[PDB]
């Protein structure tokens, strides 16, 4: 039984799509979902030179992802998927980005206690959210994005996906994951006429 | 409908001999054609071996010999190159490129195209054509997979058999479908070779 753990921040497009297309992997193959959180915030934090902008642009960046860590300390792994789900609609479909907002709607949505809300605003879940992102994004190189993911224990960048595959094309792309990870000696695949409109 | 390999080679690049050799293993296990076009290791040096330094003369050979009989003769030149260079480990350049022309049946006055500039400017439109980029340079190898260009795969050692045949299949999966861009290990890089 192939098994995907994927690491997430609600905030990241690339994520976003991605966990989609695991989902809907999901609904056509027999395998394990494992969510995990990372944050967009601790890798900015390995970059000196941040554009002022860019590091406004991510002003409050810790308040879902620390919410998320949250939840999964006090209701178990399993609630990630419904609360990034709910989160997610409202960040990448519905483009609302007032986080404190989303996180209490997306609470509410998920079913889960709103008091979860406080998380976001302490520091309390950050050794746990340090230590999540560490486990998912470690890597060699000095690329250090998303979206990552683990395909049967193979740690991957990638899938880059820019549309979300659905059914049995989503099934198809997961079985080609899983070629390459069964093969230790593959290490690389990338389109080199087009790129992701970003 | 059938299944086409591009490949753009230099015969001294050892990433270009592995994921050529395995795409003549897909070809026993998998119904596809393979055409190989000639790259250049030294143009990408420009635009930035022990043995090595005439790094020319190989891909002057090889597009010489193209030009005059055709591109299906690349493929038996360059396993005969190849095949001295990466699996013999012979790095006696001018004797490689000798020998392979009497390997592949083709006249020994080829040789003389590895110290004339006389097709450098195919050699060059062959290597752009293989080696262009919309992003960030890239390396070897490159390859079509039924008319999409990439980079990689990446390979270490040569799949072969059915194991070859699957990789192939992920490939042409991932080719098929527009809105996917890069797959990479993380956690190891390739070996120094
Ligand atoms: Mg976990
Ligand atoms: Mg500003
Ligand atoms: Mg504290
Ligand atoms: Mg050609």
Redesign the interface.
Known sequence: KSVADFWFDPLCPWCWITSRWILEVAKVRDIEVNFHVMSLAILNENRDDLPEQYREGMARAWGPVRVAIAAEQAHGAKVLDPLYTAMGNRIHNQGNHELDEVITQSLADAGLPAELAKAATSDAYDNALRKSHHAGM????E?VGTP?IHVNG??????????I?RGE?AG??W???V??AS??????????????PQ
């Open positions: 470690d890597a060699v190189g690329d990552t193979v740690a991957f960048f990638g899938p880059v996906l820019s549309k595959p094309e198809k792309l079985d080609a994951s070629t390459f093969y230790p000696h593959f290490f690389e695949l990338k389109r080199t006429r087009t790129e992701p």
